[PDB]
Amino acid sequence: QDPTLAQAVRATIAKHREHLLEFIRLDEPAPLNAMTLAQWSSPNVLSSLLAVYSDHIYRNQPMMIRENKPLISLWAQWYIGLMVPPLMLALLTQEKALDVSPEHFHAEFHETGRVACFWVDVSEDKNATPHSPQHRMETLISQALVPVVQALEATGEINGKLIWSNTGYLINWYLTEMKQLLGEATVESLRHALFFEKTLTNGEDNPLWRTVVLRDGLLVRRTCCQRYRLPDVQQCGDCTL
Ligand code: FES
């Protein structure tokens, strides 16, 4: 008997990046409290999640004026930082394409208000299985990540560009970390397409354009995630500063 897409993806990650399985569940039932983008993006629900995360980050600074912009940036770094790595691995090293529509992703949120684990109902994206690596990453961008940035941009407390900036850095970080796995051809192709092309293959704007730039012949982030502005949160080791 042949594996399901869920068992296939799960095997591929156990093979190459076993640690990523801590934050993703494939074709397992989601807990009651878990929510899809549609659910947690509701202004009342999302404002409650961010309130909890605010109290946590400022738990030792109840007098300090709070900066919602670096706060949401960090909340989103959690969300996108936990969701994307296993999806880059699945989409870039699987014959069949996993469907990444946000409605298949039930997010279980940590007690601190940030996301903790993603519970996925796995189905094939038969439209995107014939797609190359570039068009599979464009699909991740268009279907999985744009809705998320738009949900947070709707709070009126952060501009999308900062989130895209941190996402571009993240994606580039894992391409380099996965470079022996993916090969020089696919790495160079994706870097150019994702970071040095103003437009997507479908004409629309590429929101990852110039989120990483060339300085001394190596790819570094162009924009700071601003997490240093939060109390008891450390400046990133590869900050623009
Ligand atoms: S890049 Fe994170 S603090 Fe600057």
UniProtKB/Swiss-Prot annotation:
Result, substituting residue 236 to S: Loss of activity. Affects [2Fe-2S] cluster binding
Molecular function via GO: 2 iron, 2 sulfur cluster binding; ferric-chelate reductase activity; metal ion binding; oxidoreductase activity, acting on metal ions
Cofactor detail note: Binds 1 [2Fe-2S] cluster.
Disruption outcome: Removal of iron from coprogen, ferrichrome and ferrioxamine B is significantly lower in mutants compared to the corresponding parental strains.
Source organism per UniProt: Escherichia coli (strain K12)
Cofactor or coenzyme needed: [2Fe-2S] cluster
Domain observations: Globular monomeric protein mainly composed by alpha-helices sheltering internal cavities in a fold resembling the 'palm' domain found in siderophore biosynthetic enzymes.
NCBIfam families in the record: Fe_III_red_FhuF, PRK10647.1
Signal peptide (residue range): none
Entry's Gene Ontology cellular component terms: cytosol; plasma membrane
Activity regulation, short description: Displays pH dependent redox properties. SufD is necessary for the stability of FhuF.
Entry protein name: Ferric siderophore reductase
Induction trigger: Induced 2.4-fold by hydroxyurea.
Encoding gene per record: fhuF
Described purpose of this protein according to its UniProt entry: Siderophore-iron reductase which is involved in iron removal from the hydroxamate-type siderophores coprogen, ferrichrome and ferrioxamine B after their transport into the cell. Binds both the iron-loaded and the apo forms of ferrichrome.
Effect on the protein of changing residue 239 to S: Loss of activity. Affects [2Fe-2S] cluster binding
Key word Oxidoreductase present: yes
Quaternary state and interactors: Monomer.
Variant or mutagenesis effect after changing residue 225 to S: Loss of activity. Affects [2Fe-2S] cluster binding
Tagged with keyword Iron: yes
Binding site for [2Fe-2S] cluster: 224-225, 236, 239
